[PDB]
Amino acid sequence: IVGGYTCGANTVPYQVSLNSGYHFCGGSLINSQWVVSAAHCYKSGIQVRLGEDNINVVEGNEQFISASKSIVHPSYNSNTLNNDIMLIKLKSAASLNSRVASISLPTSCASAGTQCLISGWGNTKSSGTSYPDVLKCLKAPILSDSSCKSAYPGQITSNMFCAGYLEGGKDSCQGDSGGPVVCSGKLQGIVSWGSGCAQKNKPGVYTKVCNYVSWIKQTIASN
Ligand SMILES: CC(C)(O/N=C/c1ccc(C(=N)N)cc1)C(=O)O
Ligand SMILES: [Ca+2]
Known about the structure:
It holds the Pfam family Trypsin. The chain is mainly β and 223 residues long. Helix content is 7%, strand content 32%. The protein is built from two helices and 13 strands, in the order βββββββββαββββα. The strands form two sheets. A seven-stranded antiparallel β-sheet has the order 1-9-8-11-12-13-10. It is globular and about 45 Å long.
């Protein structure tokens, strides 16, 4: 997260870290057994880490649970990043409490102009590299579809939305991939892509979760 703020320990209790010997992506806990992340975050041997603030220090509130299965969206296209969403099933149910909590799936799509909370342990620099220990947060508005399409001509599908600041300086980044974009207390987006980070006229592009609720519900009802 570039140009954001320190969230505060466990103030984003649905935030997960995906670990494969090291943090490599974020995710969102949607119930005691399931995490939503980006399909581009797929790999084998994922351990889900819940209740994290400092990802490099065991602080006492964590739950580390291995993934038992990963389900990439059936229409995910890794070239265009259309349908950039994946479900991850935990080997055992998370114990839900104040520091580890699920986030609601939306019943309707969020509106342009709506403020959302984006979070992660990704790069905090728009140029160069610096990775934080503690969870970072960013408040950012959903952009109009026309401004989103104008920023990325020929690349924005109906399964994507833009959020952030056209002036640059504030954005998600590499390492935040798969993490939550929460608007009005519902999981509305997943950190997906963008040209660099916090670049002028290049806002963040996010997987449009409201399009996937039916697939999510059906998949979790059968796996
Ligand atoms: C695989 C892929 C496309 O992952 N992309 C991550 C990403 C996340 C957020 C942003 C952003 N909001 N500017 C930009 C890029 C990559 O590393 O090239
Ligand atoms: Ca920790």
